Design a protein around this motif. Structure first.
Motif, short mmCIF file in Angstrom:
data_model
loop_
_atom_site.label_atom_id
_atom_site.label_comp_id
_atom_site.label_asym_id
_atom_site.label_seq_id
_atom_site.Cartn_x
_atom_site.Cartn_y
_atom_site.Cartn_z
N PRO A 185 37.34 40.01 32.38
CA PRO A 185 37.98 38.85 32.11
C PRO A 185 37.95 37.95 33.34
O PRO A 185 38.14 38.50 34.61
CB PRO A 185 39.05 38.97 31.64
N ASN A 186 38.19 36.80 33.32
CA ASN A 186 38.16 35.60 34.24
C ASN A 186 39.51 35.62 34.95
O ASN A 186 39.56 34.85 35.82
CB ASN A 186 37.81 34.25 33.84
N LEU A 187 40.50 35.95 34.40
CA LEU A 187 41.92 36.47 34.96
C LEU A 187 41.63 37.40 36.21
O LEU A 187 42.05 37.00 37.42
CB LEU A 187 42.96 37.01 34.13
N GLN A 188 40.94 38.41 35.70
CA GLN A 188 40.96 39.79 36.57
C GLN A 188 40.15 39.44 37.81
O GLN A 188 40.49 39.69 39.06
CB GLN A 188 40.63 40.74 35.98
N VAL A 189 38.60 38.99 37.52
CA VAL A 189 37.70 38.90 38.64
C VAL A 189 38.00 38.31 39.71
O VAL A 189 37.61 38.40 40.59
CB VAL A 189 36.42 38.70 37.97
N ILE A 190 38.32 36.96 39.29
CA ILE A 190 38.30 35.83 40.18
C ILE A 190 39.67 36.21 41.43
O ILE A 190 39.49 36.05 42.51
CB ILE A 190 38.93 34.57 39.81
N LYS A 191 40.69 36.79 40.81
CA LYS A 191 41.63 37.28 41.74
C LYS A 191 41.42 38.60 42.50
O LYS A 191 42.30 38.91 43.17
CB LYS A 191 43.19 37.50 40.81
N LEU A 192 40.60 39.38 41.98
CA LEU A 192 40.07 40.47 42.79
C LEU A 192 39.39 40.08 43.78
O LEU A 192 39.57 40.65 44.91
CB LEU A 192 39.15 41.37 41.89
N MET A 193 38.45 39.03 43.91
CA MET A 193 37.82 38.40 44.83
C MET A 193 38.94 37.96 45.97
O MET A 193 38.52 38.36 47.15
CB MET A 193 36.77 37.35 44.61
N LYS A 233 38.96 38.99 49.96
CA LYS A 233 38.80 37.74 50.82
C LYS A 233 40.11 37.82 51.87
O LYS A 233 39.63 37.28 52.90
CB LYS A 233 38.82 36.62 49.81
N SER A 234 41.21 37.97 51.42
CA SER A 234 42.47 37.80 52.10
C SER A 234 42.34 39.01 53.25
O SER A 234 43.15 39.22 54.26
CB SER A 234 43.65 38.06 51.62
N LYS A 235 41.57 40.28 53.23
CA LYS A 235 41.52 41.25 53.83
C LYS A 235 40.48 41.22 54.73
O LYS A 235 39.93 42.37 55.32
CB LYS A 235 41.61 42.59 53.10
N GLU A 236 39.71 39.98 55.31
CA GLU A 236 38.54 39.83 55.80
C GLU A 236 37.56 40.03 54.78
O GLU A 236 37.81 39.42 53.49
CB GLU A 236 38.12 40.62 56.96
#
Lengths: 48, 71, 208, 123, 96
Positions: free
Chosen positions: E38-46, E50-53
Motif C-alpha cells: 500500500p501507498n501508506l507504507q511504501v512512500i514512508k519506507l522510502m 532517505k533520512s539514514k543517507e
C-alpha cells in the motif's frame, strides 16, 4: 481497526485538494492557466 | 465556539499481555512433554497456538475470529 | 479530443521530471515504440555517464509510469544550439551566484553579459525585489530590442522561474531572452520585413 | 574442502543463517519451532531469570528435532547475534538480548553444520 | 516506521535493478506499479531509508525525488544481504 465506509462522490485530483477539478489536464482550472500559457493541448501553440 | 471536546478520551492502552506459554506438562527423565491448551489444526500455523480459555469460547489468536470451540 | 488528453499527459512527464533539475532542457521526439528523449545540456555527461546504472534509473521509471510496452527506450546527449532559445541552465546559473552571494544586481548584469554575446540582439534579465530584505521592487537591466509580448508569435522566447530561500526573504527570478530563429537561417526579426536590391542598371536585379 | 578446521566448528556454524534472516529468537518462538520440523539447531542460555522457561524448551529438545547449545546470560548472547547497535568505535552498545535461537535455512550443507548436530544426537 | 520487514524486502529487489522508483502522494491505493504494498507504507519506507543517507535528496512536485547513492546499494545489501551467507561469527560454541 478501520470502521465503516461509504462516501463516493467527487473524487478529487492529486494536484488540487479542491472539490471541483479536471479530468482533462489532471489539474484544476487555475492550475489550467499555467498549462494554457504552456499550450500543452495538441494542435495549440501559443500567442493566440 | 471553536472545537471544545469534553476531555477527548486520552486513552489507556490496548493492553499488552504475557502469552502464558509457561504451561506444559513436562515429565522426569525421558522428558516427554505433552501440551496443555489445544492447538490449531491449520497447517499454516505450525501450531503451538494454545487456544485461550474463555467462558464457553476458545479461539486461536493467529486465525482471526475462526476456530470457535465452545467446549 | 481523447487523443489530446493523452498528449497533455505526455507533456506532464517532462514538467515533473524537469522541475528543479540542475541540468538543462529536454526536447522529446517519439520514434516508433521508443522515446528518443534528448537532453540539451552542457553537463549532459554527468546525467548519462555510460553503462553504469544511472542511465537505466532515468529510463525505466518513466516507462512504468506512462507509456506502452515492456521494452527499453533511448536517451540521447546533445550540446545546445544556442543556450539562449531554451534551457533551464540559464536560470540555474543565476541561482548558482545567489548562493555564497556577490551583489544580486551584479549577478543580474552577468547573465546579460553572456546572452548578447551569443547574438540575441535584445535581452532583459529581471530579478525579484527585496534587496536588503525591504519591500519588493523588482529590478530590470536590459540592452537592445527584446519582445516577450506585443509583436509576432515567433520571437523565440526563453522564460523560466526559480526561487532562492534566504533567512529573510525569497528572491524569485525569471530570466528572459529574445534571441534569433532556429540556426539554419530563417531570421525574421519583427514581422514585416523590408529589403531592397543593390543598384539599378538592370538586366539582372532581383533579390529576396 | 569444507570439514572446518580444529576448533572452528564452534562459532562459524551459524554464519550462513544470520544472513539468511531465519534465526528464530526468544524461548517462546523457539518452542513453536521445535513443535514443527523447523528446528535445525537449538541454542539456549544458562543463567536466566525464570530458568523454568528454559526447562520447557529442553523438554521439547528431548523429543524429535534434538539439538542443544549453551553459553550463559541473555544480554551477552545478543552480541554474537544482532541486537547490539554499535554507536561508538570501541564496541560499546546498549547490549540487548537475543538469547536463545533456533535456526532455519543454512542453505549450503557441510562444514560446521553437521558437526554440532551430530554431537547432541549421538554422544 | 511501524511497518514489518517483510514488506521492506520487496522494495529492495526493484532498487537493485533500478534504484529510482516513484509513487504518487495519494494514500490507500494498495498497489504501485511493481511493488504490491500500500501507498501508506511504501512512500514512508522510502522516507526512513532517505533520512539514514542512502539517497540524494531533492523534493520536486508531489513525489519526493529519491536517487540512490553507491552507499545506498550497500546499505540495502543488509536486508537482502548479497547471496545470503555473509560471513563472520554468530554462534556461541559447539554442542558436545
Amino acid at each position: 481497526s478501520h470502521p465503516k465506509n461509504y462516501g463516493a462522490g467527487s473524487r478529487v485530483c492529486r494536484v488540487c485538494g479542491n472539490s471541483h477539478g479536471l479530468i482533462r489536464k489532471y489539474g484544476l482550472m487555475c492550475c489550467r492557466q499555467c498549462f494554457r500559457s504552456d499550450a500543452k493541448d495538441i494542435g495549440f501553440i501559443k500567442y493566440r | 465556539k471553536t472545537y471544545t471536546k469534553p476531555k477527548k478520551i486520552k486513552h489507556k492502552h490496548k493492553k499488552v499481555k504475557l502469552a502464558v506459554l509457561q504451561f506444559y506438562k513436562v515429565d522426569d527423565a525421558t522428558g516427554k512433554v505433552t501440551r496443555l491448551r489445544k492447538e490449531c489444526p491449520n497447517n499454516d500455523c505450525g501450531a503451538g497456538t494454545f487456544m485461550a480459555n474463555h467462558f464457553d469460547r476458545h479461539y486461536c489468536g493467529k486465525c482471526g475470529l475462526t476456530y470457535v470451540y465452545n467446549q | 479530443v481523447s487523443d489530446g488528453v493523452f498528449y497533455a499527459e505526455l507533456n506532464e512527464m517532462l514538467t515533473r521530471e524537469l522541475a528543479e533539475d540542475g541540468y538543462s532542457g529536454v526536447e522529446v521526439r517519439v520514434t516508433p515504440m521508443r522515446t528518443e528523449i534528448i537532453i540539451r545540456a552542457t553537463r549532459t555527461q554527468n546525467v548519462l555517464g555510460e553503462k553504469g546504472r544511472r542511465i537505466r534509473e532515468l529510463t525505466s521509471v518513466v516507462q512504468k509510469r506512462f507509456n506502452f510496452l515492456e521494452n527499453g527506450v533511448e536517451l540521447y546527449a546533445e550540446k545546445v544550439v544556442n543556450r539562449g532559445l531554451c534551457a533551464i541552465a540559464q536560470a540555474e546559473s543565476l541561482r548558482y551566484k545567489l548562493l555564497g552571494g556577490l551583489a544580486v544586481r551584479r549577478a543580474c548584469y552577468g547573465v546579460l553579459r553572456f546572452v548578447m554575446e551569443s547574438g540575441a540582439k535584445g535581452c532583459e534579465v529581471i530579478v525579484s525585489g527585496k534587496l536588503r530584505a525591504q519591500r519588493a521592487k523588482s529590478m530590470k537591466f536590459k540592452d537592445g530590442y527584446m519582445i516577450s509580448s506585443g509583436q509576432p508569435v515567433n520571437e523565440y522566447i526563453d522564460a523560466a522561474v526559480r526561487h532562492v530561500l534566504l533567512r529573510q526573504g525569497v528572491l524569485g527570478i525569471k530570466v528572459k531572452i529574445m534571441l534569433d530563429w532556429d540556426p539554419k537561417g530563417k531570421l525574421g526579426p519583427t514581422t514585416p520585413l523590408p529589403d531592397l536590391v543593390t543598384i539599378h542598371p538592370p538586366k539582372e536585379e532581383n533579390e529576396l | 574442502g569444507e570439514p572446518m578446521d580444529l576448533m572452528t566448528a564452534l562459532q562459524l556454524v551459524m554464519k550462513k543463517s544470520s544472513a539468511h534472516d531465519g534465526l528464530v529468537k526468544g524461548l517462546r518462538e523457539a518452542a513453536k519451532a521445535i513443535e514443527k520440523h523447523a528446528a535445525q539447531l537449538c541454542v539456549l542460555a544458562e543463567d536466566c531469570d525464570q530458568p523454568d522457561y528454559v526447562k520447557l524448551v529442553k523438554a521439547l529438545c528431548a523429543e524429535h528435532n534434538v539439538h542443544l547449545v549453551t553459553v550463559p546470560s541473555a544480554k551477552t548472547l545478543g552480541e554474537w547475534a544482532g541486537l547490539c547497535k554499535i554507536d561508538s568505535e570501541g564496541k560499546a552498545r546498549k547490549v540487548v538480548g537475543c538469547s536463545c535461537v533456533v535456526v532455519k535455512d543454512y542453505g549450503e550443507e557441510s562444514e560446521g553444520l553437521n558437526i554440532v548436530q551430530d554431537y547432541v544426537k549421538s554422544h | 516506521m511501524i511497518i514489518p520487514k517483510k514488506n521492506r524486502n520487496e522494495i529492495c529487489k526493484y532498487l537493485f535493478q533500478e534504484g529510482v522508483l516513484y509513487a504518487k502522494k495519494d494514500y490507500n491505493l494498495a498497489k504501485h506499479p511493481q511493488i504490491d504494498v500500500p501507498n501508506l507504507q511504501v512512500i514512508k519506507l522510502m522516507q526512513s531509508f532517505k533520512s539514514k543517507e542512502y539517497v540524494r535528496e531533492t523534493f520536486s512536485w508531489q513525489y519526493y525525488y529519491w536517487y540512490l547513492t553507491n552507499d545506498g546499494i550497500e546499505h540495502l545489501r543488509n536486508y537482502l544481504n548479497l547471496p545470503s551467507e555473509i560471513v563472520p561469527a554468530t554462534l556461541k560454541k559447539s554442542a558436545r
